[PDB]
Assembly symmetry: C3
Homo-oligomer: 216 residues x 3
């Protein structure tokens, strides 16, 4: 078992991919998500409030496992670690990201989980050989979806995936049912309107409707 496996054994298999404009929404949003049993929170660096939001959730909502997404560069990677990210998700993987991740693991100060995107068998093999065997498949739905993941299970049976990209309320359970899929990223729990309006009851409702892995 990895660190990611251990977290996933204690929360729901659905990672909200969070786009948050206002820092002040971070804590209530996260509190609303954990209240519905959803603890692995990926705050993307797609807004200026992203990093600050991580730090705020980290401090104020110790039960959430808060991470950074849309980490594209080594500098993004370092800033996530400084903000207090417990995990880092990237949409793809480059030699510069591989190098950065190795280096922070070598220094031993950040012991979090790096979860990078792959989209081809060759990308999988490059990530696996850098030592990363749990990968994001991005953007899963547009690039072949369940069929792609299933085809990859044959030659790569020890690699596990988190598909992200076009995962929905209506198809997430099908992805999760794949034997090489351990979790999925989804956007619908933290839609923009919900955050701007502070509709924390609806966020909690959407989280509470997510099923545990053993219940698919």
């Amino acid at each position: 078992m990895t660190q990611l496996d251990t977290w996933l054994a204690n929360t729901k298999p659905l990672i909200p991919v969070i786009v948050i404009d206002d820092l002040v929404h971070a804590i209530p949003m996260a509190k609303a998500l954990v209240a519905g049993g959803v603890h692995l929170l990926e705050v993307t660096l797609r807004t200026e409030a992203g990093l600050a939001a991580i730090s705020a959730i980290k401090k104020a909502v110790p039960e959430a496992i808060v991470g950074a997404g849309t980490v594209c560069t080594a500098d993004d990677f370092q800033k996530a670690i400084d903000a207090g990210a417990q995990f880092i998700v990237s949409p793809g993987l480059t030699p510069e990201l591989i190098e950065k991740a190795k280096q922070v693991k070598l220094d031993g100060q950040w012991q979090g989980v790096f979860l990078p995107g792959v989209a081809t068998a060759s990308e999988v093999m490059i990530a696996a050989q850098a030592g990363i065997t749990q990968l994001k498949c991005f953007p899963a739905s547009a690039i072949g979806g369940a069929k792609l993941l299933k085809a990859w299970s044959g030659p790569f049976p020890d690699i596990q995936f988190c598909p992200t990209g076009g995962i929905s309320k209506d198809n997430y359970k099908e992805y999760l049912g794949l034997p090489n899929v351990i979790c999925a990223g989804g956007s619908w729990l933290t839609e923009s309107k919900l955050l701007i309006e502070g509709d924390w009851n609806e966020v909690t409702r959407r989280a509470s409707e997510i099923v545990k892995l053993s219940d698919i």
Copy 2:
């Protein structure tokens, strides 16, 4: 604004992907295309007459912006520049192409536009980090199409694309309407039969039917 942006603000958003067997067809073809308001001409190096065709159009049709496509190697890249290509399109990107492009930009003699193909989030990130933020998506239609481009807009909102591959009269406007799409490559304006028969009126007709970006 890039050089490409500046050209596109002054012509139609459709780049003919040209396969030309006979040098003698180059000038009348290009004259037929500009007469229909289509100025960005990608002459692929898929025939022996390709390079010569570029040079001929460059000299004789100063209003066309003439480029090279199917540039696969550094040597292809250099020969395009010697032929007088104003832009270079490649179906994919390699370290050797990245290196070549850097080197000609460093030498400062060729100030044209390099527009390379990407097909995965990781390929985008590698091109963007070499300094290229306007990319070909190839072959767009077979690898996930509008859905793929839209999914990529989330993590890569500052990258713009030119989809090529299965763009048609019937779907180009849908691609162009994507906020991260600035232009598209298409084959139908310069079909083989039209060139071999010298049917310049039909070429001009096909070009004139292309709509400006503001008119989709």
Copy 3:
């Protein structure tokens, strides 16, 4: 003509992608396949019996052309060569595999065929520039299939492909009919049940139903 071309001119265009649990099934399986006119046998390294199965077939069934698949690392590559593999198939390609293949070709002792997976135009161009012009497309059916291969024929007209992944009795002939497709990998000839039960007549039947390339 390549070595692969020469083999394919003398057998059926269908490469069984073999998953074999028990060493003892290797010889009768292979004998059943050649009896149906199917000689290019890819024994994947997805089971512990994989390597041994290669060696057994190599010795006992000299008319089969026996290879290794699911070669992911340089060490997998070397072990295949030691087992007696005549060809090596990998699901993707990495710098470490490129390097290994160069090095065994430089040493001149293994003169077999390396057939690596590609899934993007950029992957093709990287393999072609290492000197490999006959490639696996993997997993062909989930990543755009016949349409993808056809789109690639335009810029890469001298590259030939073996699609593998979701090739079936019902669609293999369509893949084979593509001018840039020379053969295909399929799983249905050596299904698990057939091997475990020793149903060699059915294996031979499935092989005998495969058509020669000139008969599509």
